[PDB]
Amino acid sequence: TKLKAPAVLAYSRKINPTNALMFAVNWSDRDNTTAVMVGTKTVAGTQSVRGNPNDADKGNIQTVNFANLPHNKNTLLVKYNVKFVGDVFKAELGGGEYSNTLQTALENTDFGTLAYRYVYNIAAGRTLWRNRVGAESIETVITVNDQTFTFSDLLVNEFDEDVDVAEIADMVAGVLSGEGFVTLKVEHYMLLGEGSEVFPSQEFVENSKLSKQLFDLNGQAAMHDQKIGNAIRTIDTWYEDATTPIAVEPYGSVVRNGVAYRAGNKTDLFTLMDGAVNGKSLTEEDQMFVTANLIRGGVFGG
Amino acid sequence: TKLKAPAVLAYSRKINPTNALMFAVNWSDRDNTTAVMVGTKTVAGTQSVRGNPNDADKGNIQTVNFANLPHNKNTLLVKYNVKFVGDVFKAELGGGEYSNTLQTALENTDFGTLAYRYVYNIAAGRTLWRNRVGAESIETVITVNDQTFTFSDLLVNEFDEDVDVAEIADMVAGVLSGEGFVTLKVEHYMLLGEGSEVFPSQEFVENSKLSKQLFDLNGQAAMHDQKIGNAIRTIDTWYEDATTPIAVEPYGSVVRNGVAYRAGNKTDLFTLMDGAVNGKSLTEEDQMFVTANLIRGGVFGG
Amino acid sequence: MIKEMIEDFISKGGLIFTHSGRYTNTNNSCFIFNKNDIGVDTKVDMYTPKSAGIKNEEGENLWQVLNKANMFYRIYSGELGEELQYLLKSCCTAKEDVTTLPQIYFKNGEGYDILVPIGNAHNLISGTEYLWEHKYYNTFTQKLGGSNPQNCTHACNKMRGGFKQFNCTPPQVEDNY
Amino acid sequence: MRKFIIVKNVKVDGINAKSSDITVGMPPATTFCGLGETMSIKTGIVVKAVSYGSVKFEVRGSRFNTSVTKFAWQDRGNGGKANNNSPIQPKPLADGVFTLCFEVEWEDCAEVLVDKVTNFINTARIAGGTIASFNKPFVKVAKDAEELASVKNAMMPCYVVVDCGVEVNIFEDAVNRKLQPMVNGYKKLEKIVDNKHMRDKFTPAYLATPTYTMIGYKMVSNVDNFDQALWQYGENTKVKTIGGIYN
DNA sequence: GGCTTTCGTCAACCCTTTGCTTATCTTCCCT
């Protein structure tokens, strides 16, 4: 009687950001874009470490990739292209029964709120991760379908109602609940100040030889699409004891805090989609969490 | 009476496509072909497997081959040729009794619809699964016998009537129903956008180093030839409860979705093949299905 | 015990071979014992349905014990008994199947022979052991039977890590020159 | 007096890289000798030897594992199991840009010879791989030995196959002298008594185990004698070079 | 009397992480 999930049931991602190239502009000269180059500086400090206090007096030489604004331009510009694709319910590897019953159990999902939180995370500048601190104003210009949309002051921890994010999110929800696609050409102008140090994505490297190795595209400082995609889907205010929005994982798990906000207490995604497939009526934000997982994608089987 | 099939009856592949080399061009300069290079990135995420709430908290580091457009070209070009080969009834391992009576039951195959669906799968961009979505405008340029056609907007899930694909299908059905060969050089111009991630063939390979390993040809992103061969033969809209075209399989079986649409309901290739040989009046659509299997080829153990 | 094992093998399908098309296709089941290539260090393969057979006190099937210390050549030359030679040879048969196997034409002079190439078992087992022993890493590794190789072959059942085959890639020509 | 036709840059993809059970990679000289006798059958131009070189060649997969092929449910009688994934028998696939040079003897103009070879290659299949592209073949003749070297250097750039022979066996010398092993032919084991499940019922059939020789890759210009790169069907149910063992 | 479907049967690893080669070039001479 229990409809088990397919062993290879997987969903493709539906929010596809590009790698976010960072340029340097002014708050006035936004047409003068010079690429933020990744430089490499050798930096000496103290050994630190929680243990081993005997070698505290010894130095610490580490070679670190840095990325800074030049001392003639005070604004960091971040360019990326977010592609919201539709058909979020057609599993590319699990189409059949389970997948399709999840679709019919998720037809009345509030796609407007999911699209609103996605477009707000793009619009409030959450895709800027550590660049936002020290920025005097973060101006987001989202060009949808040749549609300039300017945002100036949006607080990030809560999704306050405005008309421009909702205006973009109307057709973003029309794409997500239906078919087709929409492309958001996103530019972030941040008055970080003269010569402020910007924070790109850092590569994962195991061969070492360099302590911090920033993500670069032909040398220009850039951000990983995955970081932007994590920040776009940071919409999950529906876990147990929800204080801040977290990214949408199947387990509600962020790995910096070393916790899982939705595992071990029967609101991880697999339990909810098993309930929704097996005719257990989810609540509204429950369906929004499951549909946000399907928009994020992943594989849910075995 | 009751002419049995050969134990190891085999047919050769008659739609032979080449590997789809992926280049990067502009919609303006579509002659600026630039090998989309398969890059290798490393990915930090959260491990979210159906049975992993205990390990959801910890991270998950995967090295993954990616392939993205460069940020100065907004168009993905796809290169392949498709060689339609005649003698679709000449078995190379099966005997001259079952295969010839199979053949003489199959001159009444309307090859025009088979050729129309083959060239429409070529032209609509069916060979471009995850990167035909998110494309602002697709454009297929088919060059055959020094004569060139262009297709802008062809919906891929149904075969609507246009004179250009039918005009190519005239010579393709002439080759398939007759002798010789024909070759269509296909140029896919897909306006994905600036720095949009392209989707080459992933490989079924045990790789300790790379969790996801893409297909490259001299590093250049490429797609598998049998992948495009699966795309071209995705014409089967004639199975029981037919909604979408599936690939022409002997059992109508998509193992990707875990469902075999022509297995068990007496509409697979072998039951219709025995009905065609043993004088049972085969329907037109079952005739075209058996002919499409013979065009695809295969060995048939039994 | 060894006679116990040879007879355990014989109650079952009971095939000992040096060449087979079972490695090419697991659905094939053609097993061929060539007599001329049996030497001192000739590794020898055997087949049972689903690789069945009892183990000894050290936890080995017949495939381990027949393949160390040249034990198959010792039974083959009859240092352990001529009635054992008979038992061994009762399992050493040539079973033939050409389905799901490649069939090519080779020119034999004013004519052609349809050759069905089946793989040498001594080449697979001894090559895997030697190229892992002699540190030859210009190779590919392939698990032959699939997810559970006991339906294929006793060597695929026991050497689950995969067989070593030669990486036969040629050097490339650099385009920029 | 020798005549050759060269097809340069034969981009072929989908090559059955499984040369044998213990060799996966470049197709052996039995494959290209089979291609040569295939044209001797379809086009009628009877071919003595073929010298083949590899411009490019990549086996699909990693550096230690080949990419297996997702099998399709094509056998008869296993419906019901067709919804699940088909079991994979090992057949590695590869791509390769080759340069072929066929010793032919011809008595007509070079244009009809080029057209016949082109019409064969348009319907040919190198090692089970679809010929993606190929340059227009050109005819060159080896009147003398300097002319033989002209034909040799006309295959530039390609890495041809030269035979270096077997000292003791295949594994030993592949580690020791570091040469590549490949199928130079086959060894007949048993006569086949059942011709029902075969291509022909009258052609005599034998089960075979592939014999191997040890070979090296040398660029065609660095090969001193072009006869050491031209493989042909020897009368030992094997293939061999005209120049013998490369020294 | 096969014949075709589905369920039961039988297993168990020690792995290693780039080169293979390495490109087709001017002396005499007289017109």
| Closest residue in A to B45 (Cα–Cα) | A255
Segment holding C125, helix H or strand E: helix C121-133
Burial class (CB in 10 A: 0-12, 13-18, 19+), B138: buried
- A151 neighbors A163 (Cβ within 8 angstroms): no
Alpha carbons B122 and B16: distance in angstroms, whole number: 12
Q: Which residues contact B89 (CB under 8 A, 6 or more apart)?
A: B99, B100, B102, B103, B106, B294
Cβ distance C100 to B7 less than 8 Å, yes or no, reads: no
Which among D58, D89, D210 has the least Cβ separation from residue C117?
A: D210
Contact (CB, 8 A) for B231 and B19? no
Distance CA C93, CA C33 (A): 6
SS3 A276: helix
Residue D55 Cα, gap to closest chain C Cα (Å): 5
Number of CB pairs, chain C paired with chain D, less than 8 A apart? 195
- Spatial separation of the C-alpha atoms in residues B14 and B86, rounded to whole Å: 7
Which one of D14, D80, D85 has the shortest CB-CB distance to B263? Answer: D80
Q: Name C residues 30-59 whose Cβ lies under 7 Å from strand E.
A: 50-53
- Tell me if B264 and D80 make a contact (CB, 8 A cut-off): yes
Alpha helices in chain D (DSSP H): 29-42, 110-121, 145-153, 170-176
User: B205 to chain C: nearest residue by CA?
Assistant: C142
Report residue C91 CA to chain centroid gap: 14
Give B292's Cβ-side CA count (13 Å radius).
33
Chain B residue numbers with beta carbons less than 8 Å from the beta carbon of C27 are 301
Indicate if CB(B96) is under 7 A from strand E. Answer: no
Q: Which residues of D touch C111 (CB under 8 A)?
A: 203
Q: Which two tokens stand for residue D206?
A: 């034998």
Chains that touch C (3 or more CB pairs under 8 A): B, D
Task: Tell me the Ramachandran region of residue A41: left when phi exceeds 0, alpha when psi lies from -120 to 50, beta otherwise.
Answer: beta
Q: What is the C-alpha separation between D32 and D233, in angstroms, rounded?
A: 10
- Per-residue burial over B8-23, b = 16 or more CB atoms within 10 Å of its CB, e = otherwise: bbbbbbbbbbbbbbbb
Which H or E element spans position C112? strand C112-117
Q: Terminal CA-to-CA distance of chain D, rounded, Å? A: 25
The CA-based angle A171-A172-A176, given to 5 degrees, is 115
Instruction: Measure the N-to-C terminal CA separation of chain C; round to a whole number of Å.
Output: 66
- D44 Rama class: left (phi>0) / alpha (psi -120 to 50) / beta: left
User: Which residues pair with residue D142 across a beta bridge?
Assistant: D2
| Residue tagged 């390993």 (tokens) | B213
CB of D29 within 8 Å of any CB in chain C?
A: no
- Which nucleotide lies closest to D216 by the C1' atom and the CA atom? E20
Q: What is the DSSP string of B246-272?
A: B---SS-EETTTTEETTTTTT-SHHHH
Decide if B253 contacts B273 (C-beta within 8 A): no
Helix (H) or strand (E) holding D214: strand D205-219
- The one-letter code for the residue type at B192 is L
DSSP structural state of residue A280: P
Quote the CA–CA distance of D190 and A283 in Å, as a whole number.
72
Residue nearest to nucleotide E19 (CA to C1'): C171
Q: Across the interface, which of C27, C103, C175 has its CB nearest the CB of B301?
A: C27
Long-range contacts of the stretch D186-189 (C-beta < 8 A, 24+)? D186/C106, D186/C115, D186/C117, D186/D30, D186/D210, D186/D211, D186/D237, D186/D238, D187/D211, D187/D237, D188/C113, D188/C115, D188/D237, D189/C19, D189/C32, D189/C34, D189/C118
Q: Do C170 and D25 touch (CB under 8 A)?
A: yes
E21 C1' – C35 CA distance, angstroms? 40
Q: How far apart are CA D69 and CA B255, in angstroms?
A: 13
Q: Using the CB atom, is residue C164 less than 7 Å from strand E?
A: yes
Q: Of D246, D202, D244, D241, give the one whose Cα is nearest residue D49.
A: D241
> Residue C34's CB: how many other CB atoms inside 10 A?
19
> Distance from residue B263 (CA) to nucleotide E4 (C1'), in Å?
13
- Residue C99 to residue B7, Cβ atoms within 8 A: yes
Q: How far apart are CA A47 and CA A140, in angstroms?
A: 40
**Closest nucleotide C1' to the C-alpha of C138:** E18
For the residues of B86-148, what is the DSSP string, one character each? S-TT--SSS-TTHHHHHHHTSTTS-HHHHHHHHHHHHHTTTT-TTTSTT-S-EEEEEEETTEE
CB atoms closer than 10 angstroms to residue B47: 18
How far is Cα B75 from Cα B73, in angstroms, rounded to an integer?
Answer: 6
CA B237 from chain center: how many Å?
15
Window 221-240 of chain D: CB closer than 7 A to strand E: 221-222
Which residues numbered 96-155 in B keep a CB inside 8 Å of some CB on D? none
D28 touches D182 (CB < 8 A): yes
A abuts B (3+ Cβ pairs < 8 Å): yes
Question: Residue B219 — left, alpha, or beta (φ > 0 → left; ψ -120 to 50 → alpha)?
Answer: left
Assign D26 to helix, strand or coil. coil
- CA separation for the pair D36, D39 (Å, rounded): 5
D67 to chain B: which residues are within 8 Å by CB? 203-205, 213, 215
Resolution in A: 2.9
Q: If you compute the radius of gyration of chain C from its CA atoms, what whole number of angstroms results?
A: 18
The token duo for C141 is 């590794």
Query: Helix (H, G, I), strand (E, B), or coil: what is residue A54?
Result: helix
To which residue do tokens 């891929």 refer?
A: B156
Cα–Cα distance for residue pair B61/B48, rounded to 1 Å:
12
Q: What CA dihedral angle connects B18, B19, B20 and B25, to 10 degrees?
A: -100
User: What's the Cα-to-Cα distance from B118 to each of A225, B84, B151, rounded to whole Å?
Assistant: 36, 10, 15
And the tokens for D179?
């040469």
Which amino acid is it at B7? A
Q: Which of D21, D56, D233 sits opposite C107 (nearest CB)?
A: D233
Residues B152 and B139: beta-carbon distance below 8 Å:
yes
> Could you tell me which residues come within 8 angstroms of residue A130 by beta carbon, excluding any fewer than 6 positions away?
A199
Q: Which among D62, D79, D84 has CB closest to B207? A: D62
Give D-chain residues touching B63 at CB under 8 angstroms: none
Contacts of A among chains (3+ CB pairs under 8 A): B
Nearest to C114 by CA among D235, B300, D192, D16: D192
Give B 39-98 residues with CB within 8 A of chain D.
81, 83, 85, 92-93
- In residues, how long is chain D? 247
Does residue C5 contact residue D195 with C-beta atoms inside 8 Å? no
User: Does residue C138 reach within 7 angstroms of strand E, measured from its CB?
Assistant: yes
C151 touches strand E (CB under 7 A): yes
Distance, CA of D146 to C1' of E30, in Å:
26
Q: Are B179 and B87 in contact (CB under 8 A)?
A: yes
Q: How far apart are CA B148 and CA B141, in angstroms?
A: 7
B134, two tokens: 């998110």
Q: Does B5 touch chain D (CB under 8 A)?
A: yes
With CA atoms as reference, report the closest residue to B198 among B57, B35, B49.
B35
**After which residues is chain C discontinuous, taking C to N > 2.5 Å?**
none
Distance (Å, rounded) from C-alpha A121 to C-alpha A165?
A: 10
Strands C163-168 and D23-25: parallel
How far is residue C166's CA from residue C176's CA, in Å, rounded to a whole number? 29
Q: What is the largest CA-CA distance in chain C?
A: 69
The reply to whether C166 touches chain D by the CB within 8 Å rule is yes
Tokens 């979505």 belong to B133
Give the pairing type, strands B8-11 and B181-190: unpaired
Looking at the DSSP assignment, which residues form a beta bridge with residue B217? B220
Rounded to whole angstroms, the Cα distance separating B201 from B229 reads: 13
Task: Tell me the two tokens of residue D46.
Answer: 């009877």
Using a CB-CB distance cutoff of 8 angstroms, which residues of chain B are in contact with residue C99?
7-8, 301
Nucleotides of E under 7 A from a protein CB: 4-6, 9-24
Q: What angle do CA A271, A275, A281 make, to 5 degrees?
A: 135
C172: nearest nucleotide, CA–C1' criterion: E21
Which residues 203-222 in chain D have a CB closer than 7 A to strand E? 216-219, 221-222
**CB of D185 closer than 8 Å to CB of D232:** no
Interior CA angle at D84 toward D81 and D86, to 5°?
A: 85
Nearest CA among C66, C98, C91 for reference residue C80: C66
